[PDB]
Amino acid sequence: KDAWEIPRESLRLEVKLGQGCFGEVWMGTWNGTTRVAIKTLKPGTMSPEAFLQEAQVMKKLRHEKLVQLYAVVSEEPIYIVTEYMSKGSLLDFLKGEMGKYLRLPQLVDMAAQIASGMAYVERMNYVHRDLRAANILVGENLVCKVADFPIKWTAPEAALYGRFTIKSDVWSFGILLTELTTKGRVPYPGMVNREVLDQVERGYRMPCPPECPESLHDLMCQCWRKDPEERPTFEYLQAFLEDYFTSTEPQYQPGENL
Template sequence: GTAVLCKQIKPNSNQHGKYCTRKSKEIIRAPGSCLVRCSKKWKVDLMSIIPHSYAFVALKLFLVKFLYIYVYTEKEKIAIALYPYDAIHAEDLGFKKGEKHGEWWKAKSLTSRKEGFIPSNYVAEADTIETEEWFFKDIARKDAERQLLAPANKPGSYLIRESETSKGSYSLSIRDVDAQGLDVVKHYKIRSLDNGGYYISPKITFNDINSMIKHYHKQPDGLCRKLEKPCEKPKAQKPWDKDAWEISKESIKMVKKLGAGQFGEVWMAYYNNSTKVAVKTLKPGTMSVEAFLEEANLMKTLQHDRLVRLYAVVTKTEPIYIITEFMANGSLLDFLKSAAGCKVQLPKLIDFSAQIAEGMAYIEKKNYIHRDLRAANVLVSDSLLCKIADFGLARVIEDDQYTAREGAKFPIKWTAPEAINYGSFTIKSDMWSFGVLLYEIITYGKNPYPGMSNSEVMSSVQRGYRMPRPENCPTELYEIMTSCWKSKPDDRPTFDYIQSVLDDFYTATEGQYQQQP
């Protein structure tokens, strides 16, 4: 929301800007339909009230003595910190989880560079459901399942979320174990009473959701199991400094080398000694700075939960640095081969596939092309969420061993025939690569076309050969793989369609919600 003045205020002749005092009862309308009122006698610089894309309430304080600012709608509200916040800039104010405030925490707007306050996504209004550890706002059913099935949670972990299908209603999601010993998530509708109470089973009703939670902590009373502990919440992502695109090498502190590839190394690092990031260093000569920057400027506009976020670049001196968000479990290929990855069961493998399809559906919608989709270019978080990396980079690589399609570095086994033969890269050639990626996932990272050289793969595929169904691969998944490998690009499905099929792979024959206990 754009900040506006509710009442015209005369400029103070002695100071720059416009000011208000409690005495004259001027009120400022701030984002989020809140009213910000100034304390008695103290003054505020109104010129710096601006909207901010990272949901900072961007107010620059002109501190005469000591200023308190209160937030009003019908009555004063107090906000509680949901996450600890470590100051990134000198003007930021760190705080601890659970702290309350009678004044705004001053911070620095990443867009305007004006002084302001802490990120709004790190706080919630006190005495509302949003401050409860078990409440997850704006989370879809599928993502609720992913959160609950993350390694940090156990059977009995639960969360309350807003219902996707019934506006204004809530759902209870609980992690459970089925008859085969597989981890599953059960969902229960929380229904409202006319008098304002709630119930899951009409046999027992509650005045509020807190009372309901306490009851089901003591006994299951018809649920699949009793509630144990709230689902672990992923920490809200710190907003990146929007002005920090071309950054200095000195602002990056390399900490740990994570790996090395054909075109450079990957490091875990810190930006400004505060924000953990991943840094990809490119070997000199890998690509021209101009071509890279042109592509990178396009890449940074692609922002989705299933795409690795591109933060910044270093291009003034070689090697080029690419700064992205850090993903704790590294590449999907390495994770699948690891001790933890080998234990991942089929439903989670299908979910990995669905997450990648979701990211590619976004790329498809944006009329973009990845060009190098494979397990090595998908990253995994500590809560086993997948994000697609390196989208678009393949287009600007200048290495002869890569650009020559028969070169040793070219990913022949993942590349569609029309892209190999004619250089025709489209979203449909990405779909071919996705089929090979499904093979990598279901085989826990095995090399596709085992025992075959690149030239053998090229000639065999040209003659109509397709990889056989891997052991333990469901027939339905293999059918998706072969649909990705249709000879005619237009006969291959869309990522939007494949995402819907994979999302419903196990739920198509099940009811959305458990029956009332």
């Protein structure tokens, strides 16, 4: 019971946000002042240790582009409280309305910010294991942050031999690049998990998404190298994206969709 622990009182659980197997996500007010997301755990559905492992994880990881843990209610009902992100998941946001007006530059910025949060995660020798647009939260100002709550996003060695490493996160990140540039569409359209596993192993990689720049597709392809160690770092990725429109696609012109 630590200095992240708080009273449920400082927490106003205003709006529910998600329905899970082990709890619900609420949008609430912390100290009646600061807007916060609140991941509840339904006691009797999952041990506190288990549910608060993610919280313990979030503690050691303070970064501008990661969902910041804000406080915790360990003693049941077990609330985890975090900075709130107005726009919800990057997935709901890509598929959704404001998605339609997102082009490469905003998409690549997001990529960049995630790449960054993920780079932070990298420095920390942490792994995400579920890096995918559904786990990126968008904030105001297209702030996106890595959050957490799927073999299409999962690097083979991770999907197959459970070799989940930041590198397999890079892989996912590659998938997230397609989410980002397909406006949230499901990776490997028309293919189902087994067709994907079968495929990705035979060496299949998604083609260049409609109107996405080959250089962004190459980035993706790097992210999906069979050999995990060949996959780039998120320091490379971040930087590659941050600088994308100068070092990589200076001649970029907005398009219909990207």
